[PDB]
Amino acid sequence: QKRKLQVGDKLANRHGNKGVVAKILPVEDMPHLPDGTPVDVILNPLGV
């Protein structure tokens, strides 16, 4: 099954930060760097 990434799967990095998809955004939103490039990924502090 060509998997994907809907809304729930675990992400986590290499230093300890288990993800848990929240609500993937449709471009328009996001953090638009002064030069268009939006932030593909977030990860608010607090927690760990």
């Binding site: 809907q6 809304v7 729930g8 998809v21």
Partner: protein, 56 residues
């Protein structure tokens, strides 16, 4: 066989839903808080959402 129902049906399930409510537990459980139970509504995709606080 997941005959992508959708059509008006959905526009109905919320007559089974509407007003009524459901539960919600946790593994493990060391508090009656452990259930509560919320009324319902529905966004998209799998995985179930819940309101913060309850988190604690």
């Amino acid at each position: 066989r997941q005959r992508d129902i959708k059509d008006e049906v959905w526009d109905a399930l919320e007559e089974v839903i509407h007003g009524k409510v459901v539960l919600l537990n946790r593994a493990p459980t060391l508090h009656r808080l452990g259930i509560q139970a919320f009324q319902p509504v529905l966004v998209e995709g799998q995985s179930i959402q819940l309101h913060p606080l309850v988190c604690e």
